[PDB]
Symmetry: C3
Amino acid sequence: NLVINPPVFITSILLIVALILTCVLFPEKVGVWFPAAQLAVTSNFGWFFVVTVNVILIFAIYLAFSKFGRIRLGGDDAEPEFTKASWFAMLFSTGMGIGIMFFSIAEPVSHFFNTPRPVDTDIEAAVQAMQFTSLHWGLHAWGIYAMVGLALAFFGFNRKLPMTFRSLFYPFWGERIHGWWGHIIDILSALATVFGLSTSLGLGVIQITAGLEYLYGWEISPMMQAGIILFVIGIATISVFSGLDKGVKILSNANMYIAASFMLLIFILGPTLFIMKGYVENTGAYLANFIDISTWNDTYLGSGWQNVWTIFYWAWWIAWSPFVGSFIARISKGRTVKEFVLGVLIVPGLITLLWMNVFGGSALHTILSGDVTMIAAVKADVSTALFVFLENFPFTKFLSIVAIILIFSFFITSSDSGSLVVDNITSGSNGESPVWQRVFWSFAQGIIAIVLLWGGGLDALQTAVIITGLPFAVILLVMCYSLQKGLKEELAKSSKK
Amino acid sequence: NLVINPPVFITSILLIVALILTCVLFPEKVGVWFPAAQLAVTSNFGWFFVVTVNVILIFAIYLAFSKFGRIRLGGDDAEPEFTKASWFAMLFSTGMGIGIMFFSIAEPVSHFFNTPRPVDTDIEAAVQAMQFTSLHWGLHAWGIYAMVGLALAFFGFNRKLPMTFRSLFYPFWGERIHGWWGHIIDILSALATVFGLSTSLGLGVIQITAGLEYLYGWEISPMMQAGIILFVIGIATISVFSGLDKGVKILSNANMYIAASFMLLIFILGPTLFIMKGYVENTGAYLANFIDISTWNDTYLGSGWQNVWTIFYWAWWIAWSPFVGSFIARISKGRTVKEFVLGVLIVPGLITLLWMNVFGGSALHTILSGDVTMIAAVKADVSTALFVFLENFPFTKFLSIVAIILIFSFFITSSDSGSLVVDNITSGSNGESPVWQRVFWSFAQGIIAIVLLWGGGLDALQTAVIITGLPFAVILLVMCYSLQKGLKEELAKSSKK
Amino acid sequence: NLVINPPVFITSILLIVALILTCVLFPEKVGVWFPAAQLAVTSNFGWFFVVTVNVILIFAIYLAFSKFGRIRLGGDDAEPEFTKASWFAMLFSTGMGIGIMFFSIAEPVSHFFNTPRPVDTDIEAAVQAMQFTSLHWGLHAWGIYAMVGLALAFFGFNRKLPMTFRSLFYPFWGERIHGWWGHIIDILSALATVFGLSTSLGLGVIQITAGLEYLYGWEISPMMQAGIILFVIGIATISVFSGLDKGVKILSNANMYIAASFMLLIFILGPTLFIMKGYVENTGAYLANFIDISTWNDTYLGSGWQNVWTIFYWAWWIAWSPFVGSFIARISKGRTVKEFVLGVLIVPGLITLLWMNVFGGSALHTILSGDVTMIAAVKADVSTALFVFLENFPFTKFLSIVAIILIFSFFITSSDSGSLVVDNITSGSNGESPVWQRVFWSFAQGIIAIVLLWGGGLDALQTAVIITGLPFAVILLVMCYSLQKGLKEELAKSSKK
């Protein structure tokens, strides 16, 4: 009935309620304090975010290509439940649904007219734009996801422990994680994953309303935005309470199939030789200047460009890493550490770059051809970039409708996917909690997205993400260091006949 | 009296004769058809050529630095027939002997006034020219050659099958390679190797007639070029009347000694500190932006520069790869996979880069010091680049004469060497075919070179090379993926006490 | 009484006396002979210096990451006398630290108004300056130091041989090192380390006099410079004779603490976010263009910039490497080769780069913010760069006095430290020589510094350093190739059940 963890459940509820009250009955105060706080945090700790993501990626590479990579998740006498192709498909399904569909065109074009670093020619501007979107989506995001998923899988399969952030700090804290010391980590993890899920929720909402406005000229107001959010979460709780089926795996497969069909349609109807040439060239350039852009901090110029694009992306990945890592760990049992890390790092990191090329590089090809019309639309609003990019394609209305449907299905999938992660983190156990708690948490994330959207749109999701992702960046660093020790202890124990 | 393979010998004769007949009865038709076909193929599949060469090089590096590198060629109970120094010395002479002399000077200067990418200063133009020259000749070519030689040696020594391209696909096709399925593989390999050897023959004859015209002011019609071709082939077939007495290894050592003496003379008489400094700096820059230039596809500019220089070079290295790999594998028995790959990748690549520095960087030093006279000559024709370069050196006539003699001897060695590869591929066995078959194949190679020369000069060799190297690029990728399987099988079978 | 090595003692003393004579009774001739000779050697062998340092660094990396890295120094039955932190702390204290205080500010600003390569924007100039000072101080210096220290430790602990340069060539010279073939090696090593210590002493005294002149407006004639030199050396020999005996380690710890406090104070009072951002970004850029700047030889421009900055630094590191490597080996017993190399290459290099950032990047931040006043001072003279840098900080006089005291104590430590190495190399044994010989060698290095100062200032230390570092570059290459054989011998001997 009420199987909960009080010090985590009540603390998260109280903190979320306090934030909602602050943002709903101090309008001007919250609207003035949030962007100043976000700017201060990002300006002061962009170096720390960059160092954290680089260290996590280097640690993932090291774990993949060391003696620790021979350890098989779930024990030596375990076998994978899925083939490599299915595992890779599910890994790409875990990332990314809404962020990809929202930024794949807005970001490469926003790095064209607003370059991260000064360039002279438009060719170099396009190359730099593709390089920076590859940096944001290519390997560091999947590095963080792979590290969190590896930690969760190792400490929930090889250690017979709940796959929350409590058990990830066992090796160096012993039994102290059970009382008031792992409670803080669980609270921070729940808050960070809730805010990351709510950011994805909000991104989907803004893009779906922009698409409806562009297609039909409808005059939307935040009232029907809230109505859309409530209706979608109602569909989710209907699918949860009166379960038609396991509407996650089948919906994940449908989403992957529809996204692949969309990518193939854009690849064929748009440029085809240009897309392949640009994919090869841009991946090579991204891997050639990897250390130059990964560690770049904009220290000498001081343009402040990283405060909205790069540091925000690192904070987002770090903050909502628990949600992605949970489902990365669910589907990876019986696969060794090296194979797991390489599979999470490379294949989804390559498919994401392929999608980035297929969409953003095609947009940049249109722009470089003199057809500057996405630049003006994105300068007006970045939520219509996809629906302006589909204007110069055959079946513009059908492609726009399919993109809206894909966004809405990713919306349901994320809402029904992160709800169970938050429920498990909040109430412990492994899913014995009743469905009403899951529905309540879905409602909470929906209203959090609603309040954040009404408090600035795409200027309050980033603020909360960065604010709650900085301490979670610290937690990620400590968690990587503790996972090293736990893996070393397990390897030493196994190598004893 | 002809030990032959009917479906390979007859098919190769038929397609070669059909191409010759088409080129001789339809001058204008073939002269319009061939450049268009080559341009279409290169424009559509430059990305594929780049991916193929990069993947082959990465596969070679992986095979050198993994557990697969401990496998000893010819079995554990085998010892090298040559010392490491002599093996390294004769490795460089194995392939690209005539192309080195043709493009040692014409290519770095052609990348100066016709830059691959836009540059402002002449210094950057020279650096880029040397970088792209090193890319074309440094490591990818020797990566392809090392992979092909490793596959040939593994499947002709460790597994005892005949050393043709039929046996390289045994692991994943079973016994199907013996009939009408590996026949196509052998036909394509023979065509690619004959069209890659005819390209070198054409380069040699073009440069030798250009040198004769430059030195003596003679007017040589295509009839005298055909006479030169026939005279050289007659000398080659006289040398293989019955023996006599197998003047190939001695000629190979003489060619290596003469080329080394020529390089030392150019190094001493020309700049000596500049060449050494530029060698170090250019090798460092080549290894610094290796991924930047290897994966570069010229996609945002579309200048078409890669259609003649880079894609043609990849198709050339792939096309005549059987010929180079055969004699790379002949002289490598008893050497482990790691040592073999590192000795075919590094040492001959380093010596090639040293030669190309000694010649092209010296030419660029002459150009950068206000003496722009190789640019004007190369813009007119590229076959007189070396003979114009030797103009500003002491003993210009003697150096030109020894260069012509070295080109003629490389011509003889290549004609006598590739006939063996074509004859072995066409007739199977391991050298049981009669001498008249070798004579006929040398004649066919010579007339193919003559016909390609009369059909456009240095515009039909590239066309044929690219056309027959694209499907051979596919075959190279498949063979690279099958070699790891067929060699992991041997590694597993050997690691069984 | 007179326990010496007469072939080494007599030859080194006679050569030093001859140089002092030709510098003190041939002013006009030597003042033209020395800079011309230095320019000749650096121009002719900059490529050799670059190749030598790159090969040494690559060899150190390879030895750290191969089967040889498992070899435990001092034998398997040995343990580290110090913990990891206490060893990392004193690794950086072994040197540099006198040139650190001299070129922390003068070098990154001298690379600003006098760029190694042409740049347009001031931001690019600052990035290039930071990159090149990182190259000079980051990894190649510590690579040379790690190689020399590893050779010395391996041949003085695992082989029970004297820790001089005699024993480093045992593997392929056998007992021939004991007479007239290893005597030359010891003589060259003693001369190189004496001249390196003299260059450090000259830098220290130059900066001390410059700081005194800047703070107090004093006029210091070279007579007072000689008086200061003699006073400091007299303090050192008084400590050696009467004071004694372990205070060198106490003074080393005091120097490390004072330098860390000075660096922290500059980090806090000056920019704090800028320094961290620039540290991360500049380390990333240094590791991104590593092969581009390490192998750069300035061959296409011929500006001559490398003759005073990069080649001089390589020659300096190579020349005084025996002194640094001796104390790197003393404080490293019972540590495996991999751990030793990774702890000498990385951590001291990282701390040196952090010091360069904290000081030079702060200076570049001041310069880039319109405050161009260090540029004029450094153009006038580079010795007062640090004292002009502290002008725009709180507690300018206190920080200047602390820097002067730190330089003076580094002077004392370096003299008392290099006297041990010179005495041990010249008289053999392991510290049985009388104290009078030690103080005599300290006096000799002091008068060498005085004579070199009176012969051109900072134009004769570099000359002698380069002249005696080129043959020592050859010797370092030979010993680096000898260590592999002599330590593979030990690895094979140990791996025999």
